[PDB]
Motif scaffolding. Structure first.
Motif, short mmCIF file in Angstrom:
data_model
loop_
_atom_site.label_atom_id
_atom_site.label_comp_id
_atom_site.label_asym_id
_atom_site.label_seq_id
_atom_site.Cartn_x
_atom_site.Cartn_y
_atom_site.Cartn_z
N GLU A 239 -56.95 6.98 3.08
CA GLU A 239 -58.36 6.68 3.29
C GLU A 239 -58.54 5.18 3.48
N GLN A 240 -57.91 4.40 2.62
CA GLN A 240 -57.97 2.95 2.72
C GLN A 240 -57.55 2.53 4.14
N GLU A 241 -56.51 3.15 4.65
CA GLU A 241 -56.06 2.85 5.99
C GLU A 241 -57.14 3.22 7.04
N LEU A 242 -57.89 4.29 6.79
CA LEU A 242 -58.95 4.73 7.70
C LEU A 242 -60.13 3.78 7.64
N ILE A 243 -60.43 3.28 6.46
CA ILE A 243 -61.51 2.32 6.34
C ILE A 243 -61.08 1.07 7.11
N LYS A 244 -59.80 0.73 7.02
CA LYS A 244 -59.31 -0.46 7.69
C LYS A 244 -59.37 -0.36 9.21
N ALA A 245 -58.95 0.79 9.74
CA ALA A 245 -58.93 1.03 11.19
C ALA A 245 -60.36 1.15 11.77
N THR A 246 -61.25 1.79 11.02
CA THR A 246 -62.62 1.94 11.47
C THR A 246 -63.30 0.59 11.65
N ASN A 247 -63.30 -0.22 10.59
CA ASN A 247 -63.95 -1.52 10.65
C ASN A 247 -63.31 -2.42 11.69
N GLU A 248 -61.99 -2.37 11.83
CA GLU A 248 -61.32 -3.22 12.80
C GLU A 248 -61.65 -2.81 14.23
N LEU A 249 -61.41 -1.54 14.55
CA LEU A 249 -61.67 -0.99 15.88
C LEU A 249 -63.10 -1.22 16.37
N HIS A 250 -64.08 -1.11 15.48
CA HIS A 250 -65.48 -1.32 15.85
C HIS A 250 -65.69 -2.69 16.46
N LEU A 251 -65.15 -3.73 15.83
CA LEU A 251 -65.26 -5.09 16.32
C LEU A 251 -64.51 -5.19 17.64
N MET A 252 -63.38 -4.51 17.75
CA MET A 252 -62.65 -4.58 18.99
C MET A 252 -63.51 -3.97 20.09
N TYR A 253 -64.23 -2.91 19.74
CA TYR A 253 -65.12 -2.22 20.68
C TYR A 253 -66.30 -3.09 21.10
N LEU A 254 -66.94 -3.76 20.13
CA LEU A 254 -68.06 -4.65 20.42
C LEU A 254 -67.55 -5.83 21.25
N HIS A 255 -66.33 -6.26 20.95
CA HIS A 255 -65.73 -7.36 21.67
C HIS A 255 -65.48 -6.97 23.12
N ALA A 256 -64.99 -5.74 23.33
CA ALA A 256 -64.70 -5.27 24.69
C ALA A 256 -66.00 -5.10 25.45
N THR A 257 -67.03 -4.63 24.73
CA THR A 257 -68.36 -4.43 25.28
C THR A 257 -68.88 -5.76 25.82
N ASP A 258 -68.68 -6.80 25.03
CA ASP A 258 -69.07 -8.15 25.36
C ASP A 258 -68.42 -8.56 26.68
N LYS A 259 -67.11 -8.39 26.77
CA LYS A 259 -66.39 -8.77 27.99
C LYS A 259 -66.82 -7.99 29.23
N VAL A 260 -67.13 -6.71 29.06
CA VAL A 260 -67.55 -5.88 30.19
C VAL A 260 -68.89 -6.36 30.70
N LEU A 261 -69.81 -6.58 29.78
CA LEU A 261 -71.14 -7.02 30.16
C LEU A 261 -71.17 -8.40 30.84
N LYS A 262 -70.10 -9.17 30.71
CA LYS A 262 -70.05 -10.49 31.32
C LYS A 262 -69.30 -10.53 32.66
N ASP A 263 -68.70 -9.41 33.04
CA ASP A 263 -67.92 -9.35 34.27
C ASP A 263 -68.27 -8.14 35.14
N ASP A 264 -69.00 -8.38 36.22
CA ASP A 264 -69.38 -7.31 37.13
C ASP A 264 -68.22 -6.40 37.53
N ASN A 265 -67.05 -6.97 37.78
CA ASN A 265 -65.91 -6.16 38.16
C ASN A 265 -65.62 -5.07 37.15
#
Ligand SMILES: C[C@@H](NC(=O)CC[C@@H](N)C(=O)O)C(=O)NC[P@@](=O)(CCCCNCCCCN)OP(=O)(O)O
Ligand SMILES: C[C@@H](NC(=O)CC[C@@H](N)C(=O)O)C(=O)NC[P@@](=O)(CCCCNCCCCN)OP(=O)(O)O
Ligand SMILES: Nc1ncnc2c1ncn2[C@@H]1O[C@H](COP(=O)(O)OP(=O)(O)O)[C@@H](O)[C@H]1O
Ligand SMILES: Nc1ncnc2c1ncn2[C@@H]1O[C@H](COP(=O)(O)OP(=O)(O)O)[C@@H](O)[C@H]1O
Ligand SMILES: [Mg+2]
Ligand SMILES: [Mg+2]
Ligand SMILES: [Mg+2]
Ligand SMILES: [Mg+2]
Lengths: 589, 589
Positions: A239-265
């Motif tokens: 479970e601890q590992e799942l809490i770790k992956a969830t919180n980490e991945l979310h930021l990676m997702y928001l981060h990727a979202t950020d990059k997509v929104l800044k590049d039309d391509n």
């Protein structure tokens, strides 16, 4: 001194309060921690002086496991090295100092900031050790003897029974650093279990007098799965590992979202009508902190932990994992384990309380029997967070200025509707989104409500980006070979042919139109669906584990950006579907 | 007035601006004045494309702009203009501008083309129709369009008006109009004498008014060496000054944004690295909190150039917006006016709309000029509702929170102090910015106030960047050959060598340590000062015009980001300095 009292400040003027037991601590739109934990100080200290912060963690000692920090003014990720007490690398000022669990710091552990390093000791600042006013002008809480032998620094805590894991420094230079940990697959094994049958589920075990359960019953009957006497168990460690992956991945997702929104391509690869792009970006900048809940799909077994997708747009399972499984447990479980999702409702009321949602919220749902209890489950979270709501099944009760049946104004909406459906009403049909603000036979459509400028909507429009699978090749791109990711591409390249791959529509769901192919180039499984014509993504094959005749899948809920629970979906096939059931899950230590 | 008539495409409201709190915002972004034509055209653009055009005096002015600002990332886009009658068709979403004259007298007009046809186009607009619109009709008026031999021509529904053309946001300039250049002569500054009737022989400055008295106490009954003389400028130039102010301002913010995103750039300002993290946060949360700045230009038949932009700490407001009022009030029986007569109401304005706390501590160094400058501002705050208290020096400050001599807590301050001077207190002597949160003898430094986290400071930190000359080469970099810029560099390249160049400290002021080399390579003028050790920039030579035995320089104020007035500085030398006088300025039509 009482709880809340100011005992002093740390370097840069960072306050430190007494926490001798409005408990959340924010500095604007940013969450810092509970008051006044050792973690709240540490995170606030880094935010106020470096404009960086570390993910949400269960206990302090878990901070020594992180290998990245988040740069706040741009949702960017920074590399963070860890160092063992006794490292050739000196514990510079500013670094995080972590205590494992044991001794004075029982289970939690501890975290502090190294304020000033000398020749025979160092000074640290912290928040949950000292509850008394500090010597006027002293910007440190304790001194720690430091020995230096052969270019190696070792700290000696002021407690005779504590263990100091080490300190962390944000640098790219990995020399002397600790490789990122990795849990023993053995602990990630999903195990079958049985309760003793004594007919605890022989009849009406779900209260029908409770409107929410009854709503669930009216859609599924007194049932969760095939056999209510069989549950599954995972280790508190997993479970601890799942809490770790969830919180980490979310930021990676928001981060990727950020990059997509800044590049039309990049934005162009999601197949979203251009007219909407300017609205996507605005949503991003303005409603950046408004996503209330999402659910992640994981494959978890001794081979490790992998993520399939992130249901950011709209996601269910909440009623199951958070309510029925709660009553199931109360009805048949007498063990020491627990339901990892029992705090889902309160966790949701909490996110709502702190959301900028208007006073009255209109809950819009399509006419589906599952969406029926989902809507009511979300309505109870809002009523707890003290909001007012009216559920709207379909659009018929709507009319025009947008108003509902009882003549009330519609200015705040929570939708179980998928943003994609609204995107179809645009694809099918200018200087702007083609929405009506008037109609002869008062006929309101979906786009006519979600895209009207004055309506406050959850989930926000930007969520449709991390919610579309075309984001996966981007994730791979930004974090190649990341331990939790799977190679994904918009074509089938050589590396996917060897491993095998799953074909997936970028905007589908419920496992529609999915193709699993093995390295033997053999189609392991196929499904149909209405999304046959959408663009596809190709992701490295990694099949669900089979346990007790069912292929189990692990799902974690994100609530306001952080782990809110875990649950299971289990199916006789390799592919989970809208029908796949929710199996009872208990976590054990 | 205020009545909802209808909605343009996308669901964009349209209100009636009849007549018988007038500002319009969508978050912190200013839309316009309720309920004008410009306010609609900007709000329509902001809501559907996330772009907006710079502030302008009249709607007809918009047709001169050649750029749009993308709001989600202060980026600048190209905006081409096309004359009525044009091979380039008037597409939907485009701006349609009316010149001034006829129905739209002095203002001219602005509308949005909602839909093009074969012989007509529909347009949405505000302040032309003050009666409700037909249910669901998202256009306000139709206009006959005569397509002939490939050219599009629109005819207004009014018989005395003129359509300039339409504006498309694109990079393709074919068929487009070149950027309008103002006629040389309309920019000449001219001396004018009043009739000597002893209007300035006694205490012509009302010594009854405390604010004026203070100014007298610092200069006596004086503004310049001869108050029967003044300069004049055509309303055509002020037009040009309001245009170049609002545009350079955006250019300066755009440049600021870039610097704050790339260390290599930020590294050029020589600011203590411990502050970098704080500069970036400041920029992200205090983006709209800048209250006022002053720009220095060189204006004459040669054109309009910009020397610097005092964003951090700038003065001259008392002189231009109060004493010169009194001046005109005392000896001007003409038609013209003071281009900076509203300034004081302009500032009280920005303060009403600031997120400043109810109580404001005004901080100033012991200077005789700052003494009245800070009482002029204290008055701008009093007219805006805030309470204040001037603090000269740092002695009245105690401590574990920062309090004033009377005990009150200091958490919101307006300073006349330069941010660069606190920066020195860091470069004098650490895990964070070194500030005292206590001290035996109770001795607060300047740094101990401006960099304490809970203190709200104006101007906000980020202003030290556009207020620093190291940004000049950046602007030249982003907008090479811009009509208002000068080739600036961090060395004396080839070009500057042949055009002559001004040498100047990146963080100076008052003309300190300025060097002027001509194309013949000879020190035209040179000054001393305290910033001789600082890094320099080399700016293309462009000497002040000399009028009536004096070198005149044009100054414009920015209040809340937009034009707020104009004033003159005159000197015997080519280099303006602290004491250079304020020469009376009258604008003439
Ligand atoms: C939120 C769900 N539905 C919709 O969005 C319908 C949208 C549609 N009405 C529209 O207007 O687009 C959804 O499909 N979510 C995808 P999900 O989040 C949750 C799937 C639900 C599984 N329910 C099982 C019930 C079992 C009862 N015995 O997960 P994935 O399908 O894996 O994507
Ligand atoms: C605001 C001014 N001063 C400071 O910031 C000093 C701060 C000082 N107390 C500190 O210790 O940091 C300043 O120097 N501004 C530069 P400025 O904005 C305005 C100069 C004022 C000219 N006053 C003329 C009065 C004439 C009376 N007859 O303009 P430049 O010098 O051109 O840069
Ligand atoms: N790469 C993959 N390897 C093995 N199984 C996969 C893979 N991708 C998806 N699946 C299976 O398909 C199901 C649905 O795919 P998913 O990516 O979650 O999309 P959806 O949104 O349609 O649920 C998962 O639950 C999982 O069982
Ligand atoms: N490029 C230039 N060419 C000619 N004179 C200049 C130039 N730049 C500045 N000057 C003269 O020097 C004075 C001081 O320069 P300025 O850029 O305003 O810095 P400061 O902050 O010291 O006022 C100006 O007011 C002007 O008279
Ligand atoms: Mg799935
Ligand atoms: Mg899905
Ligand atoms: Mg100057
Ligand atoms: Mg200056």
């Amino acid at each position: 001194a009482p709880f809340g009292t100011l005992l002093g400040y740390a370097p840069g003027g960072v306050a430190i309060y007494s926490s001798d037991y409005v408990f959340r601590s924010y500095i604007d739109d940013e969450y810092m921690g509970h008051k006044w934990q050792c973690v709240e100080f540490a995170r606030r200290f880094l935010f106020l002086n470096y404009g960086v912060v570390f993910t949400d963690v269960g206990m302090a000692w878990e901070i020594f496991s992180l290998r990245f920090l988040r740069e706040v003014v741009n949702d960017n990720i920074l590399p963070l090295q860890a160092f063992p007490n006794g490292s050739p690398r000196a514990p510079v000022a500013g670094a995080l100092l972590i205590w494992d669990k044991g001794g004075e710091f029982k289970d939690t552990g501890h975290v502090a900031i190294i304020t000033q390093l000398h020749g025979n000791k160092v000074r640290i600042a912290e928040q949950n050790v000292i509850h008394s006013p500090l010597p006027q002008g002293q910007q440190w809480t304790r001194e720690l003897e430091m020995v230096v032998e052969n270019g190696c620094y070792t700290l000696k805590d002021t407690f005779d029974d504590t263990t100091i894991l080490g300190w962390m420094i944000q640098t790219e230079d990995t020399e002397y650093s600790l490789p990122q940990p990795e849990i023993a697959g053995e602990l990630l094994k999903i195990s079958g279990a049985r309760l003793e049958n004594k007919g605890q589920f022989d009849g009406k075990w779900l209260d029908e007098k409770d409107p929410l359960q009854n709503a669930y019953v009216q859609a599924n009957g007194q049932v969760i799965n095939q056999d209510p006497y069989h549950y599954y168990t995972i280790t508190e460690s997993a479970e601890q590992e799942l809490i770790k992956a969830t919180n980490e991945l979310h930021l990676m997702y928001l981060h990727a979202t950020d990059k997509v929104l800044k590049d039309d391509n990049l934005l162009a690869l999601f197949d979203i009508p251009k007219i909407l792009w300017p609205r996507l970006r605005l949503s991003w900048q303005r409603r950046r902190h408004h996503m209330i809940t999402g659910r992640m799909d994981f494959c978890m077994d001794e081979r490790g932990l992998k993520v399939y997708e992130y249901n950011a747009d709209s996601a269910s399972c909440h009623t199951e994992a958070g309510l029925i499984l709660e009553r199931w447990a109360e009805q048949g479980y007498k063990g020491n384990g627990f339901n990892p999702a029992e705090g889902l409702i309160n966790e949701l009321a909490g996110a709502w309380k702190h959301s900028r949602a208007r006073p009255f919220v209109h809950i819009m749902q399509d006419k589906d029997i599952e969406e029926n209890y989902h809507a009511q489950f979300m309505e109870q979270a809002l009523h707890q967070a003290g909001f007012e709501t009216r559920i709207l099944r379909g659009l018929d009760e709507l009319g025009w200025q947008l108003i509902d049946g009882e003549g009330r104004l519609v200015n705040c909406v929570w939708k179980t509707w998928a943003w994609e459906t609204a995107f179809d009403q645009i694809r099918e049909v200018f200087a702007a989104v083609p929405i009506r603000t008037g109609h002869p036979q008062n006929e309101v459509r979906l786009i006519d409500v979600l895209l009207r400028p004055e309506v406050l909507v959850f989930e926000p429009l930007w969520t449709v980006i991390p919610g579309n699978k075309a984001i996966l090749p981007i994730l791979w791109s930004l974090f190649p070979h990341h331990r939790y990711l799977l190679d994904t591409d918009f074509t089938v390249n050589d590396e996917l042919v060897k491993t095998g791959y799953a074909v997936k529509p970028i905007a589908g769901r419920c496992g529609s139109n999915i193709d699993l192919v093995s390295h033997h180039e053999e189609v392991l499984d196929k499904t149909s669906g209405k999304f046959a014509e959408q663009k596809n993504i190709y992701q490295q094959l990694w099949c669900l584990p089979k346990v007790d005749g069912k292929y189990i899948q692990v799902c974690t809920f994100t609530v306001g950006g952080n782990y809110g629970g875990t649950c299971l979906r289990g199916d006789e096939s390799l592919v989970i579907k809208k029908e796949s059931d929710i199996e009872p899950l208990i976590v054990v230590k």
